[PDB]
């Protein structure tokens, strides 16, 4: 019988309008002493909104349904009168954002490793009919070894809200999401490109002085390909960051297989990648 009393709270990892994420220690059962992450949602906040209530259901369904090395693991889920609890694996490696912030610009080999692992996670989600939408580098964490974990499947984590599409940065989201004109898994391959661009140039591809100007630039999609990148990196970017969603690399029947076949990923051994037998560019434990 998993209860809130089965866990002691250690610290707040995140705080938002709908609740909190804690680092916790399990103090009962065979897992006594194990460290987890605990997401606690406020029911009252959520049930007063039909979309959020659906989104909260979707989150738990997704987590219970996916199982993949590069996607965060759900260990337990329960609820009380006022709270919904999700017990996730604790990831000690931080957000991908922090590595990018420290490094300024990734070397291409570094970027390739992360994008390669992410592509496998995306392919898994798409097989399950799930769209990730937003690969801004805060939405990707690293485990203790330095491997990728997609984490963002639930409610908007902001305290102030703009519907939640526009509540955080929109710089990594596809034009057709911003226009609300209907979309599909192709938006993830767009977002992979935006993240790649961020990794290799220091900033996402389309940024304006304000929110209005940023949206305009994304819709116009006039990509500036820096001349310094390899031909492979440039070609992959040009095929991901396209306004015509159907024509994006990855948007076809092959999905992730299409992207993973690109010359930019030519040195990647996918069997070894998936088994996490490939040495990551950064080791959080050593940092
Ligand atoms: C739960 C997976 C995880 C595993 N291991 C270590 N760190 C992790 N997280 C990943 C998520 N990250 C961001 C975040 N999501 C949030 C959601 C909320 C919400 F309750 F929905 F309002 C509030 C604050 C939030 N902060 C906090 C640390
Ligand atoms: Zn919001």
Residue numbers in the entry: 85 to 246, 250 to 374
Article sentences:
The published S6K1-specific inhibitor, PF-4708671, was also used in this study. Recently, the structures of S6K1 complexed with PF-4708671 were published, with either the S6K1KD protein or the protein with the C-terminal extension including the hydrophobic motif (S6K1HM) and its derivatives. PF-4708671 has an ethyl group on the pyrimidine ring, which is accommodated in the hydrophobic pocket formed by Val105, Ala121, and Leu172, next to the hinge-binding site, while F108 and F109 have fewer hydrophobic interactions in these regions. The inhibitor interacts with the hinge region, and its pyrimidyl nitrogen atom forms a hydrogen bond with the amide nitrogen atom of Leu175. The ethyl group is located in the hydrophobic environment formed by Val105, Ala121, and Leu172. The trifluoromethyl group contacts the side chains of Leu125 and Lys123 and the main chain of Gly103. As compared with PF-4708671, the five inhibitors found in this study have lower potencies, in terms of the IC50 values ranging from two- to more than 40-fold. Ala134 and Lys135 form the N-terminal cap of helix αC in the complex structures with PF-4708671, F176, and F177, where the side chain of Asp136 interacts with the hydroxyl group of Tyr102 in the P-loop. In these S6K1KD structures, a strong electron density peak was observed in the Fourier difference maps and anomalous difference Fourier maps. This peak was assigned to zinc for the PF-4708671 complex.
